[PDB]
């Protein structure tokens, strides 16, 4: 059987406009391990995203952190797009600085 | 340091 | 306090796309310190924490040898398990293994672990006695038999009581400025009306290490387990973790709610309220 990913989108440090920071997308609780993750800026895929090495939790589910440097502003929109065998379509989660 | 398996270790 | 070392192996088949991938990572507590990936351009054990870099060439060579050998045997093991479950050659399958030792606050062995899974389900585990096995099903009973025949448990016990603890202790000393430093959570409470008659209180914990933490809301001193929205603890990317807990409260009753925070790094626990 298969487990669908949990997804959280958030910043390394509290967001302040005009200050460099890191945008994180944490995907967890999924199985099997193949997964596609993109960070989006105003709907467009950000190019040079890094991620952690594959590991898993005590329940055997996998987790990964995707991240990239970014500078938050008032109007730019950020999100994380995830696909996995359990999803019929990619799931989009928007960055909300209060979450 | 990881554990070393014996030769021909298999499930 | 208490400390643990774990290695996590993942072996994944991928029919039609080459031979199964084998990945191994090593952790002390919540800090990864090594990785090996059979898919790498030049597969070798690599450092992932500064304090491990001081280990000599013989260490790295020996690690890489172990993981290269495991890459090959785990490919055979995937074949074996496919057969045990009468599965076709068409599907992708995964064996996972996690093993290691737990130390108590005095540095002595608390207990050892060596557990494996197939396709995300318990498959076989070494019992706490470090002498016997628990097999999940009749397929795993076949593995148990082979392992019993080859005296695997005895070997695991020797590693877990010996090298495992010895190396863990060495890493704890070499990385003492971080591995033995607990960073307490930085905390605050936020307030957001969700209507005219209700508002959200969100209790935040940021910048903490290790990941273990307790974050709860109380109303009139009574735990609000069922009404609290609690996100999974998440990595910030700088070694630290983040978490929050939220409760929707009737407007005007905010001061009846308290957030409580327990963390190893806290001189004393915290009680927080919204500060308008």
């Amino acid at each position: 059987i298969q487990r669908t990913p949990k997804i959280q989108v958030y910043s390394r440090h509290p967001a302040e406009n005009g200050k460099s920071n890191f945008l994180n997308c944490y995907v967890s609780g999924f199985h099997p391990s193949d997964i596609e993750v993109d960070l989006l800026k105003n709907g467009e895929r950000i190019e040079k995203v890094e991620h952690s090495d594959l590991s898993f939790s005590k329940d055997w589910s996998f987790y990964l952190l995707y991240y990239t440097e970014f500078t938050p502003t008032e109007k730019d929109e950020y999100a994380c797009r995830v696909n996995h065998v359990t999803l019929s379509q990619p799931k989009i989660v928007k960055w909300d600085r209060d979450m | 340091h990881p554990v070393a398996e014996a030769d021909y270790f298999e499930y | 306090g208490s400390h643990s070392m774990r290695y996590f192996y993942t072996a994944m088949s991928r029919p039609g796309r080459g031979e199964p991938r084998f990945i191994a990572v090593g952790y002390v507590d919540d800090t990864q310190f090594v990785r090996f990936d059979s898919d790498a351009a030049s597969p070798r054990t690599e450092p992932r924490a500064p304090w491990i870099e001081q280990e000599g060439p013989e260490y790295w060579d020996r690690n890489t040898q172990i993981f290269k050998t495991n890459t090959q045997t785990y490919r055979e093991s995937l074949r074996n398990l496919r057969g045990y479950y009468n599965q076709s050659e068409a599907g992708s399958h995964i064996i996972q293994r996690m093993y290691g030792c737990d130390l108590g606050p005095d540095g002595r062995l608390l207990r050892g672990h060596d557990q494996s899974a197939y396709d995300g389900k318990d498959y076989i585990a070494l019992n706490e006695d470090l002498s016997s096995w628990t097999a999940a099903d009749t397929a795993a009973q076949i593995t148990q038999r082979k392992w019993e025949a080859a005296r695997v448990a005895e070997q695991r016990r020797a590693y877990l009581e010996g090298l495992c603890v010895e190396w863990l202790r060495r890493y704890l000393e070499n990385g003492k400025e971080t591995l033995q430093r607990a960073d307490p959570p930085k905390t605050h409470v936020t307030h957001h009306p969700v209507s005219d008659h209700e508002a959200t209180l969100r209790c935040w914990a940021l910048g903490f290490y290790p990941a273990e933490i307790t974050l709860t809301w109380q109303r009139d001193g009574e735990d609000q387990t069922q009404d609290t929205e609690l996100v999974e603890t998440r990595p910030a990317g700088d070694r630290t973790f983040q978490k929050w807990a939220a409760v929707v409260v009737p407007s005007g009753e905010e001061q009846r709610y308290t957030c409580h925070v327990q963390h190893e790094g806290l001189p004393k626990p915290l009680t927080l309220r919204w500060e308008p």
Side-chain angles (χ1 to χ4, degrees):
Chain A
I1 99 127
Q2 300 177 325
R3 278 174 267 178
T4 205
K6 294 176 286 210
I7 305 167
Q8 295 194 62
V9 189
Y10 58 99
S11 54
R12 178 179 300 183
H13 313 289
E16 46 187 323
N17 299 325
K19 187 184 178 185
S20 189
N21 200 330
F22 279 84
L23 172 64
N24 291 334
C25 185
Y26 182 58
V27 288
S28 62
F30 60 93
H31 212 288
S33 58
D34 277 355
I35 195 162
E36 185 168 7
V37 179
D38 307 294
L39 300 182
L40 307 177
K41 183 183 179 187
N42 300 311
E44 290 159 2
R45 175 181 174 279
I46 301 167
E47 227 197 317
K48 275 186 180 177
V49 176
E50 308 228 275
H51 61 262
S52 58
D53 303 320
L54 188 68
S55 194
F56 51 91
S57 303
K58 283 186 301 183
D59 66 4
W60 309 109
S61 63
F62 295 101
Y63 63 85
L64 296 174
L65 179 64
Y66 288 71
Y67 54 99
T68 185
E69 322 185 353
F70 82 139
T71 297
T73 66
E74 176 192 305
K75 299 175 185 180
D76 283 320
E77 273 181 318
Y78 291 93
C80 183
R81 181 177 54 207
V82 173
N83 206 176
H84 184 258
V85 65
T86 58
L87 298 167
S88 346
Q89 214 87 26
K91 189 178 293 187
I92 301 282
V93 178
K94 298 171 175 298
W95 178 52
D96 179 341
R97 43 184 89 198
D98 300 325
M99 304 280 282
Chain B
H1 195 291
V3 68
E5 305 301 335
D7 296 338
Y8 323 136
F9 168 73
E10 75 173 13
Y11 293 55
Chain C
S2 285
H3 294 288
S4 68
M5 182 162 68
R6 287 289 186 283
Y7 285 86
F8 299 94
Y9 295 174
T10 306
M12 304 136 279
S13 66
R14 57 194 163 179
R17 301 191 297 108
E19 290 298 312
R21 184 200 221 211
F22 173 89
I23 300 175
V25 294
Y27 279 78
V28 169
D29 303 324
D30 292 316
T31 298
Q32 185 190 344
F33 68 97
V34 290
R35 65 163 189 209
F36 170 99
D37 185 349
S38 68
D39 270 354
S42 301
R44 80 273 183 184
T45 316
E46 305 174 352
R48 300 289 285 170
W51 49 262
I52 201 68
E53 294 169 13
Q54 65 185 276
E55 300 301 336
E58 261 302 305
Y59 178 91
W60 300 107
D61 295 335
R62 167 94 203 101
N63 270 250
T64 297
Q65 182 268 105
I66 287 167
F67 296 139
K68 277 179 154 299
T69 302
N70 294 168
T71 298
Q72 304 301 135
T73 67
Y74 272 85
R75 290 170 178 173
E76 186 87 351
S77 299
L78 280 158
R79 290 190 282 262
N80 292 170
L81 266 63
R82 187 178 68 225
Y84 299 166
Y85 291 104
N86 307 303
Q87 292 167 333
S88 72
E89 293 321 331
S92 292
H93 292 98
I94 296 177
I95 295 176
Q96 284 156 276
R97 179 174 162 206
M98 61 190 169
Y99 68 86
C101 42
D102 302 336
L103 300 184
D106 61 335
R108 58 146 172 230
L109 182 73
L110 226 38
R111 76 155 291 178
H113 304 268
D114 196 320
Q115 306 162 253
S116 295
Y118 185 59
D119 294 336
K121 299 169 53 63
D122 284 17
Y123 182 77
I124 192 183
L126 185 62
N127 293 329
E128 187 171 11
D129 65 10
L130 308 185
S131 306
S132 65
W133 303 98
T134 294
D137 56 33
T138 51
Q141 295 173 14
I142 305 311
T143 300
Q144 181 177 332
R145 293 182 183 174
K146 295 197 197 175
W147 287 4
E148 279 165 350
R151 297 185 184 89
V152 177
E154 286 85 344
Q155 196 270 336
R156 301 299 188 233
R157 175 180 172 190
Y159 165 80
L160 292 163
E161 295 181 324
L163 285 176
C164 190
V165 170
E166 295 155 15
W167 281 106
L168 175 49
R169 298 179 180 125
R170 172 177 170 83
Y171 301 150
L172 289 166
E173 171 66 18
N174 290 346
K176 65 179 167 188
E177 296 174 359
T178 50
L179 297 179
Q180 304 188 54
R181 192 185 78 231
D183 299 324
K186 304 172 192 173
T187 60
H188 70 284
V189 174
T190 65
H191 184 270
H192 300 303
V194 305
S195 81
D196 285 343
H197 201 134
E198 277 178 329
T200 301
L201 299 174
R202 181 166 294 104
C203 189
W204 287 85
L206 300 168
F208 58 95
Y209 180 96
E212 171 66 28
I213 194 170
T214 308
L215 205 64
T216 56
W217 276 106
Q218 290 180 11
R219 180 208 62 212
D220 301 336
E222 188 179 355
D223 280 48
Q224 293 292 280
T225 305
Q226 194 65 41
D227 306 281
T228 302
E229 186 191 2
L230 214 51
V231 292
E232 181 180 17
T233 303
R234 63 197 197 192
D238 57 6
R239 117 173 185 118
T240 70
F241 296 86
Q242 305 180 352
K243 196 185 192 67
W244 59 252
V247 75
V248 164
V249 307
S251 269
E253 300 191 2
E254 281 91 347
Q255 298 309 307
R256 282 216 246 168
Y257 290 81
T258 49
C259 176
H260 299 257
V261 189
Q262 289 197 95
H263 183 89
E264 175 189 347
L266 288 174
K268 245 149 320 183
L270 311 182
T271 289
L272 295 82
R273 27 182 79 273
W274 172 50
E275 301 171 356

